[PDB]
Write an enzyme that holds these catalytic residues in place. Structure first.
Site, mmCIF file in Angstrom:
data_model
loop_
_atom_site.group_PDB
_atom_site.id
_atom_site.type_symbol
_atom_site.label_atom_id
_atom_site.label_comp_id
_atom_site.label_asym_id
_atom_site.label_seq_id
_atom_site.Cartn_x
_atom_site.Cartn_y
_atom_site.Cartn_z
ATOM 1 N N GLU A 34 8.386 10.419 -8.406
ATOM 2 C CA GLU A 34 7.927 10.930 -7.460
ATOM 3 C C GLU A 34 6.259 11.574 -7.404
ATOM 4 O OE1 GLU A 34 9.139 11.303 -4.476
ATOM 5 O OE2 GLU A 34 11.578 11.030 -4.837
ATOM 6 N N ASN A 45 3.751 11.249 5.114
ATOM 7 C CA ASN A 45 4.562 10.465 5.501
ATOM 8 C C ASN A 45 4.326 9.772 6.813
ATOM 9 O OD1 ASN A 45 6.314 10.969 3.347
ATOM 10 N ND2 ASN A 45 6.874 12.962 4.265
ATOM 11 N N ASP A 47 5.795 9.691 9.575
ATOM 12 C CA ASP A 47 6.222 10.588 10.597
ATOM 13 C C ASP A 47 5.352 11.927 10.846
ATOM 14 O OD1 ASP A 47 7.169 12.277 8.943
ATOM 15 O OD2 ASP A 47 9.268 11.727 8.995
ATOM 16 N N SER A 49 4.759 14.337 8.435
ATOM 17 C CA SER A 49 4.946 15.496 7.518
ATOM 18 C C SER A 49 4.290 14.844 6.225
ATOM 19 C CB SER A 49 6.626 15.511 7.068
ATOM 20 O OG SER A 49 7.090 14.167 6.742
ATOM 21 N N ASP A 51 4.824 15.305 1.875
ATOM 22 C CA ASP A 51 5.682 15.728 0.524
ATOM 23 C C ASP A 51 4.547 16.269 -0.597
ATOM 24 O OD1 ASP A 51 7.699 14.206 1.699
ATOM 25 O OD2 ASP A 51 7.522 12.763 0.357
ATOM 26 N N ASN A 58 9.348 17.801 1.214
ATOM 27 C CA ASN A 58 8.950 17.294 2.577
ATOM 28 C C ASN A 58 8.750 18.671 3.453
ATOM 29 O OD1 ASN A 58 9.557 16.176 5.264
ATOM 30 N ND2 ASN A 58 9.308 14.356 4.399
#
Ligand SMILES: [Cl-]
Ligand SMILES: [Cl-]
Ligand SMILES: [Cl-]
Ligand SMILES: [Cl-]
Ligand code: NA
EC number: 3.2.1.17
Length: 128
Positions: A34, A45, A47, A49, A51, A58
């Protein structure tokens, strides 16, 4: 940026070893893929959002970053808390995530790169 064994030790101290049945190597493997063991990692991301942190938590569901419309803050923290050198906020929020019904499949890197593998290799040689 943690070392592998350093992060394993910190995760164990903060209660992740065998949490909801996931051995410590699962958590270390997930963090490696990660974030590369970097508490400051951030990734946007598609969309809108983002992380955050050592486990790439998220903002759509788990933390407030001030810029993710229609999102929730289920961990009740600013997303910046997930970037601290201190992994407590990331661990406490990850405990909530892994408890939510899908286990560690919440972490795409875990599903694709750790699940089913010899995850105990991630803690070999560590004094914990
Ligand atoms: Cl070291
Ligand atoms: Cl393990
Ligand atoms: Cl992946
Ligand atoms: Cl050491
Ligand atoms: Na949010």
């Amino acid at each position: 940026v943690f070392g592998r064994c350093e992060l394993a030790a910190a995760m164990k101290r903060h209660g992740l070893d065998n949490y909801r049945g996931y051995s410590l190597g699962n958590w270390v493997c997930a963090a490696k893929f990660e974030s590369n063991f970097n508490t400051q990692a951030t990734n946007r991301n598609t969309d809108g959002s983002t992380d955050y942190g050592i486990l790439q938590i998220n903002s759509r569901w788990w933390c407030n970053d001030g810029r993710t419309p229609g999102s929730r803050n289920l961990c009740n923290i600013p997303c910046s808390a997930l970037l601290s050198s201190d992994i407590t906020a990331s661990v406490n929020c990850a405990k909530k995530i892994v408890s939510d019904g899908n286990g560690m499949n919440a972490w795409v890197a875990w599903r694709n790169r750790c699940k089913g593998t010899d995850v105990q290799a991630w803690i070999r040689g560590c004094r914990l």
